[PDB]
Amino acid sequence: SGIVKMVNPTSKVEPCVVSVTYGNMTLNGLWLDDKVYCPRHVICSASDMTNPDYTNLLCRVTSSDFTVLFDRLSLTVMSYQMRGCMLVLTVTLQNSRTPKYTFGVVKPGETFTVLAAYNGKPQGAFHVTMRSSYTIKGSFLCGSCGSVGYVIMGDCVKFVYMHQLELSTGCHTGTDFNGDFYGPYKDAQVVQLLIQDYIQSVNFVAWLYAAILNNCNWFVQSDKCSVEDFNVWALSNGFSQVKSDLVIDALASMTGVSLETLLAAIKRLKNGFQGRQIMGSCSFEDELTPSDVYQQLA
Numbered sequence: 204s205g206i207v208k209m210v211n212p213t214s215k216v217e218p219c220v221v222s223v224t225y226g227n228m229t230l231n232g233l234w235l236d237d238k239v240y241c242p243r244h245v246i247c248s249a250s251d252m253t254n255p256d257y258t259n260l261l262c263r264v265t266s267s268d269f270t271v272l273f274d275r276l277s278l279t280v281m282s283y284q285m286r287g288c289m290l291v292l293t294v295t296l297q298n299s300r301t302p303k304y305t306f307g308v309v310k311p312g313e314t315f316t317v318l319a320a321y322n323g324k325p326q327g328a329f330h331v332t333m334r335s336s337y338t339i340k341g342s343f344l345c346g347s348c349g350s351v352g353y354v355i356m357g358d359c360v361k362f363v364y365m366h367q368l369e370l371s372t373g374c375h376t377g378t379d380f381n382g383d384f385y386g387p388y389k390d391a392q393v394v395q396l397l398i399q400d401y402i403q404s405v406n407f408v409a410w411l412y413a414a415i416l417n418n419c420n421w422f423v424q425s426d427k428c429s430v431e432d433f434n435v436w437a438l439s440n441g442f443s444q445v446k447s448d449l450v451i452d453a454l455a456s457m458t459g460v461s462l463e464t465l466l467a468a469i470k471r472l473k474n475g476f477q478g479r480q481i482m483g484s485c486s487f488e489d490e491l492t493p494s495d496v497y498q499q500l501a
């Protein structure tokens with residue numbers, strides 16, 4: 204028993220973390236095969252950050268201007284390409300430790316592991332949940348840009364995130380591996396307003412199912428609320444739209460408690476828990492998906 208935010212093992216991703224330097228700027232990159240992916244703002248100086256003209260900045264850049272390090276091993280950049288807000292450098296050396304990998308794009312509510320890196324050196328890992336605002340609540344200092352988020356799917360590493368910006372205190376965003384930012388955010392040093400965030404309802408439902416299997420069911424009552432009725436209520440109560448899933452169905456079968464029973468429970472919990480905790484919390488713990496809790500339940 205017990206429910207915690209678990210990170211995926213890091214062994215497959217650690218040998219891909221590199222340092223990328225251009226001018227006075229050093230950030231992190233991801234070395235897969237003979238390609239090095241990194242944020243494109245590595246090529247802009249402090250004077251060119253409010254509204255950088257990246258295409259004009261790329262004219263003054265040569266492959267020799269990049270210093271790519273895998274610890275002390277210097278990689279030779281043959282060529283480079285700008286793909287959205289990301290640079291894809293081609294190096295002479297294939298990473299012999301490149302794992303089986305794919306690129307993916309996470310949706311709000313989905314979780315992944317961030318391998319925090321500084322100066323191309325992994326420091327540790329942490330669990331993040333993509334918010335409805337297309338931001339994550341991570342821990343990143345200047346120099347952690349280029350740290351990657353990933354999820355292990357089977358024996359494959361699915362890379363989903365490359366850290367780029369801090370939109371406000373403890374509020375971070377980055378791009379997918381197509382170079383597209385999550386949300387409408389841009390790599391510009393300007394104040395950027397956040398997309399509307401919501402309590403990830405299906406993640407809180409997962410928390411409630413996990414609580415039932417962790418000797419906590421006081422919130423379960425005879426009232427039921429359909430998905431349709433919950434989704435209308437959710438619009439005006441800061442909760443995201445709910446959709447049933449095969450994992451929710453498995454959780455309903457393991458506990459004998461229907462989704463509708465928990466949707467009615469959420470509406471009651473919205474006006475207060477009355478000092479009672481659900482697994483040590485009086486908050487809408489929406490950081491773990493149904494799949495995350497399912498892996499910690501029996």
Ligand SMILES: *c1cc(-c2ncccn2)nc2c(C3CCC(F)(F)CC3)cnn12
Pocket residue numbers: 244252344345346348367368369370389390391392393
């Ligand atoms: C380092 C630190 C930061 C930062 N730290 C805290 C709050 C906000 N920002 N930002 C940056 C950048 C930044 C430059 C502008 C940009 F290109 F648009 C995005 C990245 C670079 N290095 N740091």
